[PDB]
Each structure stands twice: as structure tokens, then as C-alpha cells.
Amino acid sequence: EDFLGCLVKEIPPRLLYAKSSPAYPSVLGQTIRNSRWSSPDNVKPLYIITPTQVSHIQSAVVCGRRHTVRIRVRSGGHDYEGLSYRSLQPETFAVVDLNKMRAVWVDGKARTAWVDSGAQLGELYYAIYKASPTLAFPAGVCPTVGVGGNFAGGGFGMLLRKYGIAAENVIDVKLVDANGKLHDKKSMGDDHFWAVRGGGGESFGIVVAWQVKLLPVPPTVTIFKISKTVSEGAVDIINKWQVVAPQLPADLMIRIIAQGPKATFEAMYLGTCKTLTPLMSSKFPELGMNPSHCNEMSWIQSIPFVHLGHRDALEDDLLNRQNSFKPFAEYKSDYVYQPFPKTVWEQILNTWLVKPGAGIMIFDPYGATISATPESATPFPHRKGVLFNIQYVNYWFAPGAAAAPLSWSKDIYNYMEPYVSKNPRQAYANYRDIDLGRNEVVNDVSTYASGKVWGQKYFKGNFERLAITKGKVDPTDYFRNEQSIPPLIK
Ligand SMILES: *Cc1cc2c(nc3c(=O)[nH]c(=O)nc-3n2C[C@H](O)[C@H](O)[C@H](O)COP(=O)(O)OP(=O)(O)OC[C@H]2O[C@@H](n3cnc4c(N)ncnc43)[C@H](O)[C@@H]2O)c(*)c1C
Ligand code: NA
Ligand code: NA
């Protein structure tokens, strides 16, 4: 009652939604990307606030502190467990939803931009393009992902070998802390500014906007997508790829998608067919690439082409707030430091990817720039020595069809354990997986011991510094969820 009362004093009421409000279901559902989490059995927010100004965010936080109602912040809503808009167990929370704060201001000459957290990646990329055809930013591949969560958790895509992760190309932020105070880099200090750029969403406050450096790309890039069935020698080719791809020049990224006994090699090359063809011949002739495979286009055109296979619909693919694709979905991830034996590739392609409920596996090679940053330089620790990341993706489309996919996801994670990283078994924070572990709350504070179980998997040796920073900026654990950094205080 009095939390809502506090909000109405400071924030335009058209931006406030209670469960009884007629628009509440629409506002709640607008950026839910996973049908597992939209159904009525999920725990719902007591209130939703859709700020349009930074002062609205500050007022919401001050009200939540005064009346002890916690806030989950949502930008693009892609959280794999939905923790930006649901809780796992019954509890009271408000959602602060940033979708209306979506400005992108590009300074093409300075090669910098200010980007609101509620902007989607496609909108960031398109705004950069409206300014220059030869500037880029290295974040995710999916245009509807929100800037807020993508940058907070790291963020990587087809430029990761050239330029590393999104978070290490951030040069300032505008942030509201757990006391409602407005911060930038200078007022936050080294620890807090280090933590917020890759240490995971929610934990370190609400980032309102990010200042980024914009990076050069040539006017023409080249994409290919070359598939090999097991009959065409997929196992021998991918067994070579895992050693070669992490060692290729920074200008060339070759990722793999597999969903059966067949591997599709997708390359982004910062250059032309003319130079790519000989490079492939010299370094990876086993793939059988030739000039007919090349698709030359601008960097901006490469974003819908890689993600959707589209060449012809730039605005529609990058400026898209319809929220049409809502699979039921499960996700896991791994990091690989040692080459798989050929027999493991045999098993993955011929056996694991031909089971009931089998999903899709995506393999991103590291090396080059992402691996040159020291492990502790940012909170993202998956750097030197990483050959490739694996994402295990399961989609299904009817409510009662979950059992086989969920079982496959668990079974293949168990199968892969001996061949992937261990002690800890590393995972990417933005591929959130609650089965890696969740927090325990004691005296209303997330415990350090419970955070450490999953926290070492996402952040390896950076977890303790994250928790000590959390203790300094949010000792009462105001901004939290079931898998957020717990405070470690003296
Ligand atoms: C759905 C989806 C996700 C993808 C896709 N492809 C990716 C890619 O190519 N590269 C990646 O690095 N990641 C990819 N992912 C995963 C996404 O990066 C993550 O799912 C992001 O965390 C999603 O961010 P966003 O869309 O903003 O999701 P939310 O659910 O709103 O938030 C996630 C998380 O972060 C907190 N949070 C949100 N907003 C803020 C701000 N402004 N400040 C601090 N913290 C924030 C939330 O509370 C929540 O905890 C491809 C697809 C299709
Ligand atoms: Na290890
Ligand atoms: Na999950």
C-alpha cells in the first residue's frame, strides 16, 4: 500500500502498473522471450514501473528502500531463467522495466556512443550504421537482446576474436545504486566500475546508459556458411577446426552450429573474398572453401545474415519489438581448454544429436583478442587457453513437451563432464543456468557460501572480488535474485 503510495508521489501514474491494471499482463509479457516463464504458475511482480527518465528510476529505488520492496530490473527480457521479471519462489517484488529508455546517441567523429540500457542490440547497431558504414560494436548476435543485461554479463558475438567482449569496450556508465544515488565511472571508483562491466546483471545496481567506444570495420566483410555431413567427413574436419580456429588471425571467426550428424561452419571475415580464399587454402583447406561460398556485404548487413540468413530486410530485422519468437527454452554452456578426442566428436554428431529432445550445439572459437585480456582484468574469466565455448540450446513449442528436452540437456551435460573445463566447470554468466546452483538467503541476505557454488563457475577467480565489491556498494543485498553476487563484508 505505502510502497505504491510513495511511487505515485514521484512518478507519473501512467508509468505504474498493479496486477489489477488492465495493461499489466501486456506490459509484463512484452519482453518475455521464453514460454516457460510467461504462464500463470510463475511468480508475478506486485508492481511494474516503466520509467522514461533517470529521476523515475531514482524515485523507484528510494521508495523500494524506504518500504523494503525489492526491484528486479529488466531491459530486453532475454534472461534465460526470466529472473528480470519472475522469482523462483513466492515473494514480493516490483519490476523496473527500461524498454521506454532506448535512446542511442552516436558521435561518429569521436567514435563513441551513449546507449540506453532499454535499447535492443539491433537498435544500437542500426544507429551506429546511420552514423557510419565503417564503425561497429562487438556485442551479441541476436537483435532483440537488451543492452542492459548483455553488457552487464559480458556480451560476445562474431567480433569477439577481433575486439573481445562488449563490457571491455565500455568507457563510462550512468548508474543508480542501491541508495538511489546517480553515479558515473569517476564517482563509482575502480572496484565498482570493474564489477559492473561483466559481473552479471542486477547485482551492482541499475545501469541507465553505457558509453561505448566504436570500432573500425572494413566497408566489406565476408560471410560463408559451409555444411559437412558425417558422410562428407564432418568428424575429421571439426577435429581439425578445434585446434586451427582458435589460432586463426583475429580478422576471421569460424563458429559451428550442429543439430544432427552434420556441422555448419559459419564464418565472419573482416575482409574480402579475394583475401579470404587464399587464407582458407593455407590454414584450413580441410573445409573445402572456394569463392562461390563467399557472401560479401557491409558489417550492418552481416547481423541479420548471420542470425537469420536474411540479406534483404535490414530495418525490419534490426528494429523489431513485436516479440514474435517465444519458444519454451532450456540452455547450458561449457568452456573447452583441451581438444576433444575424435571419438567424442563421433559421439556428439552421431549419437547425442540424434536423441529424443536433442537440441542444438553452438561452438564459438576464442583465442586472439578475447584470450589476450588477463583473466582478472574484467570479471569475465574465460580467456587465455580457451579453445571454444559451447552453448547447448533446447527449444520446444507445446507446454507438455518439456520432459525429453530437459532430460537430454541434463544427460548431455553429464556426458561432456570429462572433456570440458573443471574445478570449476566454467559457464558463461549471460547463458544463465539455475541448475549450476542458487543462493540461500539468511537474515534477508544472500550467503557467500551459497553464491560461491555457481559464482566460481561464471567468474572463476574473480568471484571473491565481486562479492567484496557487492559488500561495499550494497551490504543489505537490496538488488538481488536467486543467482546474484552475495555481499562479503568485514
Ligand atoms: C534471448 C537471447 C539471448 C541471447 C542471444 N544471443 C546472445 C549472444 O549472441 N551473445 C551474448 O553474449 N548473449 C546472448 N544471449 C544472452 C543474453 O546476453 C542474456 O540473456 C542477457 O542477460 C539478456 O539481457 P537483456 O535482454 O537485457 O535481459 P534481461 O532479462 O532484462 O536482464 C538480464 C539480467 O540482467 C539484469 N539487468 C537487466 N537490465 C539491467 C540494467 N539496466 N542494469 C543492471 N542489470 C540489468 C536483469 O535483472 C537480469 O538479471 C540470443 C537470444 C535470442
Ligand atoms: Na580448471
Ligand atoms: Na535453465
Automatic annotation (TrEMBL):
Identify the residues that bind FAD: 73, 75-79, 84, 141-142, 146, 149-150, 156, 202, 207, 428, 430, 432
Cofactor dependence: FAD
**Do the record's keywords include Flavoprotein?**
yes
GO MF assignments: FAD binding; oxidoreductase activity
Q: Which PROSITE patterns match?
A: FAD_PCMH
**Which Pfam families did the record assign?**
BBE, FAD_binding_4
FAD-binding PCMH-type domain: residues covered: 41-217
Matching Gene3D superfamilies, A to Z? 3.30.465.10, 3.40.462.20, Uridine Diphospho-n-acetylenolpyruvylglucosamine Reductase, domain 2
User: What keyword terms does UniProt attach to this protein?
Assistant: FAD, Flavoprotein, Glycoprotein, Nucleotide-binding, Signal
InterPro entries, per the entry: BBE, FAD-bd_PCMH, FAD-bd_PCMH-like_sf, FAD-bd_PCMH_sub1, FAD-bd_PCMH_sub2, Oxid_FAD_bind_N
What family does the database annotate?
A: Belongs to the oxygen-dependent FAD-linked oxidoreductase family.
Q: Which PANTHER family would you find in this protein's record?
A: OS08G0158400 PROTEIN (PTHR32448)
Q: Could you tell me what this protein is called?
A: Pollen allergen Phl p 4.0202
From which organism does this entry originate?
A: Phleum pratense (Common timothy)
**Taxonomic classification:** Eukaryota, Viridiplantae, Streptophyta, Embryophyta, Tracheophyta
